[PDB]
């Protein structure tokens, strides 16, 4: 209904601007948030109620014009999802593009384009091929006309040949606001709400659980909270969590795929009787609190039973290296047997051996098992000195 029908990624090089734009569209100035942050993922979500005012028929997300002061009327909602730092976004795209709809590419006018930073992000937009592209030329009050328009053909000649090559060049003060009515009126023409079968089997990405039970009836069943990526949700409905509950059987982790029943549904900040794909979404349910306190499920898929991806104790995977730009070490060496490598997909995170190696492909045996569909993407990072670094990405044979 009126929850976020769109994911909208912030990217772009470190303080271009993406988190006060972000901040500018949301209307937030103040205050943590740090609750519905992923684990596995480090990424935020933010909406947005996207308006149009009927006096002047400027777009803004506010309930208020900013410009006449007249009241607006809703047209959408959406969600915004910045991530702290370059790596972060980077492993979230790459693992998991069916999280995003779109996304604003924020380049911000005073500094030399292009930088190692955006030409990577816009890497990652190509090989996930999402094209719903808006291009933020940000800081534009801090250049004169010339250099202005020298940035904007610098963007342009940069964006020739990508998948942001028909992105409109909106130049904006993510600090100050200023045009920002054009940058809002261009998600709605550009990133518009996809076209979603309501009916394929429904499938959400855990990104945390917890226990809402209060310190010290209403001795609340387990929640969890993640991205619908297909289907929808409904109140009754009866769901499936794979790969489900560790257990330990002749000395071994075992995973036992768990069934539960949704009992509330939080979306766009408010109870609801069905939520889809878009923003976060609050799935109550009716499992013993004790299961998903302090994120025990976070990386599972929740589905209908019998209508989930496989699980996976071993991944065979065609490799995809990246011809890395951003402290040298830029030169991405082969994958070695033995290596120990991390592996997202979806929301799930876990270490992987490599045991064995073909044309451009690895075997690799999971510490954590994994639940997705052959042809998923998976992001591989290997740790270089004493951090993981992404090196490039996996797709899922059988
Ligand atoms: N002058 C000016 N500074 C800006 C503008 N937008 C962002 N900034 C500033 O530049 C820095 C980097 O911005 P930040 O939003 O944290 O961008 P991020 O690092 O891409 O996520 C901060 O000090 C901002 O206040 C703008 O339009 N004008
Ligand atoms: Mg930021
Ligand atoms: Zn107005």
Same mark, same amino acid.
């Not at 990133?191 to 039970?213: A, E, G, H, Q, Y």
């Not at 549904?265 to 349910?285: I, K, M, S």
């Not at 890395?324 to 051996?353: C, F, H, Y």
């Given at each position: 209904?009126?929850?976020?029908?769109?994911?909208?990624?912030?990217?772009?090089?470190?303080?271009?601007?993406?988190?006060?734009?972000?901040?500018? =569209?949301?209307?937030?100035?103040?205050?943590?948030?740090?609750?519905?942050?992923?684990?596995?993922?480090?990424?935020?979500?933010?909406?947005?109620?996207?308006?149009?005012?009927?006096?002047?028929?400027?777009?803004?997300?506010?309930?208020?014009?900013?410009?006449?002061?007249?009241?607006?009327?809703?047209?959408?909602?959406?969600?915004?999802?910045?991530?702290?730092?370059?790596?972060?976004?980077?492993?979230?795209?790459?693992?998991?593009?069916?999280?995003?709809?779109?996304?604003?590419?924020?380049?911000?006018?005073?500094?030399?384009?292009?930088?190692?930073?955006?030409?990577?992000? =816009?890497?990652?937009?190509?090989?996930?091929?999402?094209?719903?592209?808006? #291009?933020?030329?940000?800081?534009?009050?801090?250049?004169?006309? %010339?250099?202005?328009?020298?940035?904007? &053909?610098?963007?342009? %000649?940069?964006?020739?040949?990508?998948?942001?090559?028909?992105?409109?060049?909106?130049?904006?003060?993510?600090?100050?606001?200023?045009?920002?009515?054009? =940058?809002?009126?261009?998600?709605?023409?550009?990133? !518009?709400?996809?076209?979603?079968?309501?009916?394929?089997? !429904?499938?959400?990405?855990?990104?945390?659980?917890?226990?809402?039970?209060?310190?010290? %009836?209403?001795?609340?069943?387990?929640?969890?909270?993640?991205?619908?990526?297909?289907?929808?949700?409904?109140?009754?409905?009866?769901?499936?969590?794979? !790969?489900?509950?560790?257990?330990?059987?002749?000395? &071994?982790?075992?995973?036992?795929?768990?069934?539960?029943?949704?009992?509330?549904?939080?979306?766009?900040?408010?109870?609801?009787?069905?939520?889809?794909?878009?923003?976060?979404?609050?799935?109550?349910?009716?499992?013993?609190?004790?299961?998903?306190?302090?994120?025990?499920?976070?990386?599972?898929?929740?589905?209908?039973?019998?209508?989930?991806?496989?699980?996976?104790?071993?991944?065979?995977?065609?490799?995809?290296? =990246?011809?890395?730009?951003?402290?040298?070490?830029?030169?991405?060496?082969?994958?070695?047997?033995?290596?120990?490598?991390?592996?997202?997909?979806?929301?799930?995170?876990?270490?992987?051996?490599?045991?064995?190696?073909?044309?451009?492909?690895?075997?690799?045996?999971?510490?954590?098992?994994?639940?997705?569909?052959?042809?998923?993407?998976?992001?591989?990072?290997?740790?270089?000195?004493?951090?993981?670094?992404?090196?490039?990405?996996?797709? #899922?044979?059988?």
């Amino acid at each position: 209904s009126r929850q976020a029908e769109v994911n909208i990624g912030m990217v772009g090089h470190v303080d271009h601007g993406k988190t006060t734009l972000t901040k500018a =569209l949301t209307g937030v100035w103040t205050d943590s948030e740090e609750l519905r942050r992923g684990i596995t993922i480090k990424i935020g979500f933010a909406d947005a109620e996207i308006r149009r005012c009927p006096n002047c028929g400027r777009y803004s997300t506010s309930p208020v014009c900013p410009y006449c002061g007249h009241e607006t009327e809703f047209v959408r909602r959406v969600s915004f999802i910045d991530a702290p730092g370059h790596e972060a976004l980077m492993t979230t795209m790459l693992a998991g593009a069916s999280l995003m709809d779109g996304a604003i590419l924020v380049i911000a006018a005073n500094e030399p384009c292009p930088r190692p930073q955006t030409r990577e992000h =816009l890497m990652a937009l190509q090989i996930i091929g999402q094209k719903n592209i808006i #291009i933020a030329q940000n800081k534009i009050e801090l250049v004169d006309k %010339e250099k202005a328009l020298e940035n904007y &053909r610098q963007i342009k %000649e940069f964006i020739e040949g990508t998948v942001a090559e028909n992105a409109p060049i909106i130049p904006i003060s993510a600090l100050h606001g200023a045009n920002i009515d054009v =940058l809002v009126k261009a998600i709605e023409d550009f990133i !518009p709400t996809p076209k979603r079968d309501p009916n394929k089997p !429904p499938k959400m990405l855990v990104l945390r659980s917890f226990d809402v039970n209060k310190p010290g %009836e209403k001795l609340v069943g387990g929640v969890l909270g993640g991205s619908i990526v297909q289907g929808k949700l409904k109140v009754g409905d009866e769901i499936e969590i794979r !790969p489900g509950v560790p257990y330990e059987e002749h000395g &071994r982790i075992k995973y036992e795929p768990i069934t539960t029943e949704i009992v509330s549904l939080q979306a766009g900040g408010q109870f609801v009787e069905e939520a889809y794909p878009g923003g976060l979404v609050g799935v109550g349910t009716k499992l013993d609190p004790y299961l998903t306190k302090g994120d025990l499920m976070a990386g599972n898929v929740v589905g209908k039973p019998g209508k989930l991806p496989p699980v996976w104790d071993s991944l065979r995977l065609e490799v995809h290296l =990246l011809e890395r730009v951003v402290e040298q070490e830029l030169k991405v060496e082969p994958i070695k047997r033995k290596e120990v490598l991390l592996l997202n997909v979806g929301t799930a995170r876990t270490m992987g051996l490599v045991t064995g190696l073909g044309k451009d492909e690895i075997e690799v045996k999971l510490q954590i098992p994994v639940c997705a569909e052959p042809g998923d993407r998976v992001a591989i990072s290997r740790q270089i000195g004493s951090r993981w670094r992404l090196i490039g990405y996996g797709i #899922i044979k059988e």
